[PDB]
Amino acid sequence: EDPSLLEWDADDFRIFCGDLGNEVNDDILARAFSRFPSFLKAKVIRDKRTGKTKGYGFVSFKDPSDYVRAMREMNGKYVGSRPIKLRKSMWKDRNLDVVRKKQKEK
Amino acid sequence: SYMLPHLHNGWQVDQAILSEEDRVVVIRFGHDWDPTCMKMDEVLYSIAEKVKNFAVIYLVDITEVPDFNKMYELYDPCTVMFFFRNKHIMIDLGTGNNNKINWAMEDKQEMVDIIETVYRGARKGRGLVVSPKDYSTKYRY
Amino acid sequence: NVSQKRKYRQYMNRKGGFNRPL
Amino acid sequence: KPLPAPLDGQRKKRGGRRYRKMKERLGLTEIRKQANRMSFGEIEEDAYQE
Amino acid sequence: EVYAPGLDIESSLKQLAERRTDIFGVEETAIGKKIG
RNA sequence: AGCUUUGCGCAGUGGCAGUAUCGUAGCCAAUGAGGUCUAUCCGAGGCGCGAUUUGCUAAUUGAAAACUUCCCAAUA
RNA sequence: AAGGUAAGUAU
RNA sequence: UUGGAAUACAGAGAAGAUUAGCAUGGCCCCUGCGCAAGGAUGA
């Protein structure tokens, strides 16, 4: 149900950014957070009509070393008002969900 | 002996307060030659070494910078405004004016506790925060 | 003895009307 | 020696057995045994037994 | 460092001595006297 | 050729892992660390400082524990 | 007289 | 399945919490792998 996420699946090292202000989070904020040279992702979940972000975004990088570096590099420090939180993206696709359901037997 | 940094110009204090990141900017308004303000400056100097990591103290002179006297109603000695995160915090300590500490603290540890509580409140994002010790009474008895 | 489901009004986060729907 | 900045407490990312071993080694297991509950009715001790 | 440099400290002390004339200046005029 | 002594790294089990342990860009060092037993002497660092990886998953509280459409009049 | 301004969020 | 409705907002933590288990790492016994190497025996 998320074709864009499939296009975003190219970069493996995906981090979940949380505690984002509705107006605080922006593309410029992601660019300022794009310390590593690898291509980032500024996509953040937001309201369909008003565009008010729920505070959760995902940043994808092709460098797991940059992932590890940024895990402790930008924990608690963010340019805007609301301080940033970083979590290991436990994101799953429908195929992974079906595989987990099948393997839940043992 | 009042060796803390002092704002020679009013606009310098403005940009100094603006140039803050994850720190609390304690701007102590008043005059160094006042005796109660001298005691407050001595207390701030004593605190400065212990809490310099997140608490920065930056004094200013009302005569040197009178433009901010009317901004926050600066008409008393020993006034302290915890202008942190570019937001004037609401520090409530059992007083009518819960945004200004206008008397020298009796003990340094009390001021350290107050400033760390202010830092916690500012980091949490709330614009108001209470004090563990109410100052409605001076505990004179 | 029977008991149908009980409905409720969604006053919170409702921009449809100022007054709660009935 | 400046005092450390009181950052907001962060819980353990993943509770480990070694972390559980530290919890087993150090914790409030003995304090939990001593119940601080007080009966609504009066106790047999005096007002200021202490 | 947190504290101001030596020049700033000297300037602050000179200003304090010039303003507070109780313990500075030729004569003790007043606490807030511009000229002692 | 078999076998044995021993250590490092790795692999497996077991074991301890807040009197448990490393880190140190500090510091005394086999040219001799450091002794209060032994001072033609024992021989190992002494004692500071900085602290106690990563990953899986459950459970609890709360209205909500954060993974990229509601509702309305009737109907297909 | 008072010691009795919740903060937050864009308008 | 159409179309649209979608001062104010929210409100004392939501700037997503609390507690707990297993594995690994580290440590160390045993054993194994890689491997330095000497020692003696036998046809």
Curated annotation (Swiss-Prot), chain A:
Family the UniProt entry places it in: Belongs to the RRM RBM42 family.
Subunit-level organization: Interacts with HNRNPK.
Domain of life, source organism: Eukaryota
Source lineage: Eukaryota, Metazoa, Chordata, Craniata, Vertebrata
Annotated RRM domain residues: 13-91
Role according to the record: Binds (via the RRM domain) to the 3'-untranslated region (UTR) of CDKN1A mRNA.
Chain's gene name: RBM42
Subcellular location: Nucleus; Cytoplasm
Source organism (scientific name): Homo sapiens (Human)
Protein name stated in the entry: RNA-binding protein 42
UniProtKB/Swiss-Prot annotation, chain C:
Modified residues (Phosphoserine): 3
Coiled coil: none
PTM section of the record: Phosphorylated in vitro by snRNP-associated protein kinase.
Annotated localization: Nucleus
Protein family according to the UniProt entry: Belongs to the SNUT3 family.
Subunit structure: Part of a tri-snRNP complex.
Protein task: May play a role in mRNA splicing.
Annotated protein name in UniProt: U4/U6.U5 small nuclear ribonucleoprotein 27 kDa protein
Organism: Homo sapiens
Taxon lineage: Eukaryota, Metazoa, Chordata, Craniata, Vertebrata
Gene encoding the protein: SNRNP27
Curated annotation (Swiss-Prot), chain D:
UniProt region (Disordered), positions on chain: 1-17
Modified residues (Phosphoserine): 39
Ranges spanned by the short sequence motif Nuclear localization signal (NLS), renumbered to the chain: 11-24
Processing and modification events after translation: Phosphorylated by PRP4K during spliceosome assembly.
Cysteine pairings via disulfide bonds: none
Tissue-specific expression: Ubiquitously expressed.
Task performed by this protein: Involved in pre-mRNA splicing as component of the spliceosome. Required for the assembly of the U4/U5/U6 tri-snRNP complex, one of the building blocks of the spliceosome.
Domain notes: Interacts with the snRNP via the Nop domain.
Annotated family: Belongs to the PRP31 family.
Subunit structure: Identified in the spliceosome B complex. Component of the U4/U6-U5 tri-snRNP complex composed of the U4, U6 and U5 snRNAs and at least PRPF3, PRPF4, PRPF6, PRPF8, PRPF31, SNRNP200, TXNL4A, SNRNP40, DDX23, CD2BP2, PPIH, SNU13, EFTUD2, SART1 and USP39. Interacts with a complex formed by SNU13 and U4 snRNA, but not with SNU13 or U4 snRNA alone. The complex formed by SNU13 and PRPF31 also binds U4atac snRNA, a characteristic component of specific, less abundant spliceosomal complexes. Interacts with PRPF6/U5 snRNP-associated 102 kDa protein.
Name of the featured protein: U4/U6 small nuclear ribonucleoprotein Prp31
Organism of origin: Homo sapiens (Human)
Lineage start: Eukaryota, Metazoa, Chordata, Craniata, Vertebrata
Residues of the full protein shown: 341 to 390 of 499
Curated annotation (Swiss-Prot), chain E:
Residues the record lists as Phosphotyrosine modifications: 3
Signal peptide: none
Tissue specificity annotation: Ubiquitously expressed.
Subcellular location(s) of the protein: Nucleus; Nucleus speckle
Assembly behavior: Component of the 17S U2 SnRNP complex, a ribonucleoprotein complex that contains small nuclear RNA (snRNA) U2 and a number of specific proteins. Part of the SF3A subcomplex of the 17S U2 SnRNP complex which is composed of three subunits; SF3A3/SAP61, SF3A2/SAP62 and SF3A1/SAP114. SF3A associates with the splicing factor SF3B and a 12S RNA unit to form the mature 17S U2 small nuclear ribonucleoprotein complex (17S U2 snRNP). SF3A1 functions as a scaffold that interacts directly with both SF3A2 and SF3A3. Identified in the spliceosome 'E' complex, a precursor of the spliceosome 'A' complex.
Function: Component of the 17S U2 SnRNP complex of the spliceosome, a large ribonucleoprotein complex that removes introns from transcribed pre-mRNAs. The 17S U2 SnRNP complex (1) directly participates in early spliceosome assembly and (2) mediates recognition of the intron branch site during pre-mRNA splicing by promoting the selection of the pre-mRNA branch-site adenosine, the nucleophile for the first step of splicing.
Domain notes: SURP motif 2 mediates direct binding to SF3A3.
Protein name (record): Splicing factor 3A subunit 1
Organism field: Homo sapiens (Human)
Shown stretch of the complete protein: 454 to 489 of 793
